[PDB]
DNA sequence: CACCCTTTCATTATTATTATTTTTTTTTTTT
């Protein structure tokens, strides 16, 4: 894996091709339709795309359901590039509770 | 490399009189590429042989390109297109009065001349086009990337390429021999559907001055 | 470079098709023999490939305008709107064979095959008008590829491509409009309406007995002249339909694209039909996209000012000797 | 045998017109024939008025007519050759359907030139290549160049006659237009789609438009049989002289 | 000779023609 993306080594070998053209055509400014099956580890490939865009200076936003959130930040903790640029989460009013009522 | 090329169409195309040869398509594509990469004032005779294909030499001269003709698999029934040509007589009359037109004749002629109305009908086929050739796949892809039309470069909208695909195949599968060949070709290369005629075997297949005594297949 | 013009037709679209087409009075197209039929000239339709339905390809009808009508319409609006006022503000007088080469795609400048050097091929393909189409005895390839007017329709989804799924039509798009001609002598009321006729009552009566004798003789032959009383049919494409128009230029100059843009600026007064008496083919332009970027506005074309300056200095400098040298 | 202009000497006997120029300079092809006009060969400059519609089918652009197709460009050679086969022995009119049964299906001669007029009169004999072998017939019809094979047409006739066997009324398996101008030229008929199989439909659909144009004149309600032609060679010779 | 009119000739012959048949769910975690 010479000249690999950040976090590429934890992505499976089958998803490496989708990841490379997805990063390439998002580097060109196009909206990329990338399709993979359930057990092929799309979270790791998404992490690679987010890290490789984050080292360019880009403000990267990852939109996902709240069940996918924990494994997405699980794929976003140990790579050094998102450790350098930081990772945060935006949560709404239904993520919290009223203290007085509870 | 002994590869094989399909083109599928987003628009119906003119059914070719005689054979659509793949090397003719690549020659026209290389002419367009040379027009982009030099400019407009060039000789198309110079660059339409600069092709990434093999060149078969018959036993006593008469060399041809190693590229078989386009075999046609009809997705659609072979319909017909009509086109007409006529100069608008009304604008000619108003330009004749306005002085912008200098026409001594006071009457047109729809059977002949500048104001001739002409009707003509050409076959139309929507098809998968499969050819067989020996050459480099990368150069054929680089040529066919510009190939927006095939069969007719009509400028009027026909033969628009939905896509193309080149794959290598084994030797015994590929019928390269299905091509216009010289009469001195090898006995293993002459088939039953080949017959002796006047045909071009190379380059501009429309140029009747280059047409030779050839053994060629029937579309 | 590509120009995609999305237009809506204000009036119906009619481009007549060849063949002998017959419709009944109810609407059945091409009846079996032994029943009363009707003359019908359908609008032009091609059988195109369809991936709708199943993954296999099926042949479906698609009702279009042919691309030749598009090419001649674009050509004629450039001549009528920018080329002719420029050439008559200078005093230029074209010749037949140069007018025939500019206005039609014909080789009557010299019917002979005129040889074309590569330098003169280059200097005529870079002309703001001439290099778009070419034509004449040179028979050189024009730079303008004008496509058919395709309606945004589900039968054309292979032709249209992805992205037109929003604002898309389906189902039938042809309506068989029935037209007729009445013998207007039968419409004549009284002496005040008939006094303009030489003969008047005598001439009107004579035509009525002539038409009566011809009709009864034709009906007796059924169990070669023809009267004025006609009633026929023609399929038109429905008005208000959205259409895409693809104009792809093979290595264009700035002035050529500017000429196409100034054609689109003034083509609202043009028509696209075989219905010029009935005002068929009136359209307004809703979108013009150059290289994927939309440029049309409500007050004409806003954008491409380099093309506009190029075409202004191109149409200013032409003196029609280049048209004559293009012909012969 | 090599060129269409070889019919001017091998089949009929004709000479160059008086006043034609000999060829000078480097050798160039004819504007019409495609024959290379060598030095020592007679030629004409192109002085046509603006009624010659056939600019699209000019072989070259040397602005020169070879004398043999100066002869082919005169009017009796135009209308008298409106539908004919020009073999090495004579000129046979093929306007009868029986004659096209004779030539398209099992023709005796190998080398000839087959011309048929779509319109009333067109420049036809010089722009068509010579049929060299019978297995690949080159036909001109109007502005269209056409290819016919005898064996495939014989196979088509055998298929259509066996599927039409047992029916008193002749049913057309696949429609072909005689003018080749209707859109439905080459279309399989409904009943003919039933009484042909799918491989037979693909075979009748895959043929070149020359065989479709031949089977228009050969597959219809009454069926032609192959009989030889009336020789119009003396007829067009009397027209020419 | 470039610009047109208007004359002239030609042999066989037939005609078929694509168009469609849902289910009625209650998810999700925004302001
Ligand atoms: Zn010749």
Ligand names:
zinc ion
Number of strands of chain A: 0
Largest sheet of chain C: 6 strands, antiparallel
Number of beta-strand segments of chain C: 15
Determine Rg of chain C (CA atoms, Å): 25 Å
Oligomeric state = part of a larger assembly
Structural class of chain A: mainly alpha
Report what the structure shows.
The structure is cut from a larger assembly and holds chains A (102 residues), B (219 residues), C (328 residues) and D (241 residues). Chain A has 102 residues and is mainly α. Chain A is built from four helices and no strands. Chain B has 219 residues and is an alpha+beta fold. Helices cover 17% and strands 31% of the residues of chain B. In chain B, the strands form four sheets. Chain B has a four-stranded antiparallel β-sheet, with helices on one face. In chain C, the strands form four sheets. In chain C, strands 1, 7, 8, 11, 12 and 13 form a six-stranded antiparallel β-sheet that branches. Chain C has a four-stranded mixed β-sheet with strand order 2-3-10-9, with no helix packed on it. In chain C, strand 4 and strand 5 (58-63) form a beta hairpin. In chain C, helix 1 packs across helix 8 (254-266) and helix 8 (254-266) crosses helix 9. The longest helix of chain C has 24 residues, at 67-90. Chain D starts with 6 loop residues before the first helix and ends with a helix. By secondary structure, chain D is of the alpha+beta class. In chain D, the strands form three sheets. In chain D, strands 7-6-8-9-10 form a five-stranded mixed β-sheet. In chain D, strands 1-4-5 form a three-stranded antiparallel β-sheet. Chain D is 28% helix and 15% strand. Chains B and C meet through helix 1, strand 6, helix 3, strand 7 and strand 8 of B and strand 4, helix 1, strand 6, helix 2 and helix 3 of C. The structure holds one DNA strand of 31 nucleotides. The PDB classes it as structural protein/rna/dna. The entry lists the keywords Nuclease, STRUCTURAL PROTEIN-RNA-DNA complex. The entry is titled "CryoEM structure of type IV-A CasDinG bound NTS-nicked Csf-crRNA-dsDNA quaternary complex".
């Amino acid at each position: 894996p010479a000249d690999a993306l950040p976090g590429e080594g934890a992505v499976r070998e089958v998803l490496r091709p989708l990841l490379k053209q997805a990063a390439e055509k998002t580097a060109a400014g196009k909206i990329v339709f990338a399709e993979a099956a359930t057990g092929t580890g799309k979270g790791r490939m998404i992490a690679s795309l987010a890290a490789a865009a984050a080292i360019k200076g880009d403000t990267v936003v990852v939109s996902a359901p709240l069940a996918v959130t924990w494994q997405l930040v699980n794929d976003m903790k140990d790579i050094p590039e998102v450790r350098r640029v930081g990772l945060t989460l935006s949560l709404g009013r239904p993520n919290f509770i009223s203290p007085q009522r509870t | 490399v002994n590869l094989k090329v399909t083109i599928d169409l987003s628009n119906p195309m003119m059914e070719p009189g005689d054979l659509l040869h793949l090397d003719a398509l690549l020659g026209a594509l290389r002419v367009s590429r040379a027009r982009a990469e030099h400019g407009d004032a060039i000789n198309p005779r110079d660059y339409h042989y600069d092709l990434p294909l093999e060149r078969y030499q018959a036993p006593s001269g008469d060399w041809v390109f190693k590229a078989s003709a386009f075999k046609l698999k009809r997705q659609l029934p072979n319909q017909m297109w009509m086109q007409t040509g006529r100069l608008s007589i009304v604008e000619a009359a108003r330009h004749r009065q306005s002085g912008y037109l200098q026409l001594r004749a006071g009457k047109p002629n729809p059977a002949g001349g500048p104001f001739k109305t002409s009707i003509y009908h050409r076959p139309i086929v929507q098809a998968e086009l499969t050819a067989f050739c020996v050459g480099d796949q990368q150069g054929i892809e680089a040529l066919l990337s510009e190939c927006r039309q095939i069969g007719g470069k009509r400028g009027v909208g026909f033969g628009q390429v939905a896509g193309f695909k080149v794959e290598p195949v084994a030797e015994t599968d590929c019928p390269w021999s299905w091509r216009a060949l010289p009469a001195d070709a090898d006995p293993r290369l002459v088939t039953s559907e080949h017959a002796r005629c006047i045909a071009a075997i190379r380059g501009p297949y429309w140029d009747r001055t280059l047409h030779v005594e050839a053994l060629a297949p029937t579309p | 470079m590509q120009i995609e013009v999305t237009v809506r037709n204000i009036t119906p679209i009619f481009s007549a098709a060849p063949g002998s087409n017959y419709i009944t009075i109810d609407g059945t197209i091409n009846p079996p023999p032994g029943v009363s039929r009707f003359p019908l000239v359908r609008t032009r339709m091609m059988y195109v490939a369809a991936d709708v339905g199943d993954g296999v390809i099926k042949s479906v009808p698609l009702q279009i305008v042919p691309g030749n009508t598009m090419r001649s319409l674009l050509r004629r609006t450039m001549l009528k709107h920018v080329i002719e006022p420029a050439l008559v503000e200078k005093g230029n007088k074209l010749s037949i064979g140069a007018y025939a080469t500019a206005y039609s795609g014909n080789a009557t400048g010299n019917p002979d095959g005129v040889p074309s050097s590569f330098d003169e091929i280059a200097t005529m393909r870079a002309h703001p008008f001439i290099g778009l189409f070419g034509g004449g005895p040179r028979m050189l390839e024009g730079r303008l590829m004008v496509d058919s007017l395709y309606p945004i329709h589900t039968n054309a989804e292979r032709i249209l491509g992805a992205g037109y799924e929003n604002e898309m039509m389906s189902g039938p798009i042809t309506q068989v409009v029935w037209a007729r001609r009445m013998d207007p002598i039968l419409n004549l009321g009284s002496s005040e309406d008939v006094e303009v006729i030489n003969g008047g009552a005598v001439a009107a009566n004579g035509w009525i007995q002539d038409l009566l004798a011809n009709s009864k003789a034709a009906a007796s032959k059924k169990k070669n002249g023809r009267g004025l009383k006609a009633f026929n049919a023609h399929e038109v494409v429905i008005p208000g339909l959205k259409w895409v128009w693809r104009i792809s230029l093979d290595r264009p100059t700035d002035a050529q694209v500017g000429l196409v843009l100034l054609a689109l600026n003034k083509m609202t007064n043009e028509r696209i039909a075989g219905g010029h008496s009935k005002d068929y083919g009136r359209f307004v332009i809703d979108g013009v996209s150059l290289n994927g970027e939309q440029v049309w506005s409500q007050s004409g074309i806003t954008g491409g000012e380099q093309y506009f300056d190029a075409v202004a200095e191109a149409i200013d400098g032409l003196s029609s000797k280049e048209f004559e040298q293009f012909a012969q | 045998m090599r060129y269409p202009s070889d019919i001017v000497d091998q089949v009929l006997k004709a000479g160059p017109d008086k006043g034609l120029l000999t060829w000078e300079g480097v050798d160039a092809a004819c504007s019409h024939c495609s024959r290379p006009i060598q030095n020592g060969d007679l030629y004409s400059p192109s002085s046509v008025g603006a009624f010659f519609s056939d600019t699209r089918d000019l072989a070259s652009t040397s602005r020169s007519i070879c004398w043999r197709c100066v002869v082919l460009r005169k009017k009796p050679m135009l209308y008298g050759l409106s539908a004919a086969v020009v073999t090495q022995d004579g000129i046979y009119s093929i306007s009868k359907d029986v004659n096209k049964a004779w030539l398209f299906t099992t023709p005796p001669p190998a080398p000839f030139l087959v011309v048929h007029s779509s319109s009333t009169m067109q420049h036809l004999s010089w722009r068509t290549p010579v049929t060299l072998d019978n297995r690949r017939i080159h036909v001109r019809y109007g502005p269209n160049l056409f290819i016919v094979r005898p064996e495939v047409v014989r196979k088509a006739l055998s298929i259509a006659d066996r599927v039409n066997e047992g029916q008193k009324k002749w049913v057309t398996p696949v429609y072909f237009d005689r003018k080749a101008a209707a859109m439905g030229h080459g279309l399989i008929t409904r009943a003919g789609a039933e009484m042909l199989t799918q491989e037979e439909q693909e075979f009748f659909q895959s043929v070149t438009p020359g065989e479709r144009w031949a089977l228009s004149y050969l597959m219809h309600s009454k069926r032609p049989e192959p009989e030889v032609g009336e020789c119009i060679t003396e007829k067009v010779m009397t027209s020419l002289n």
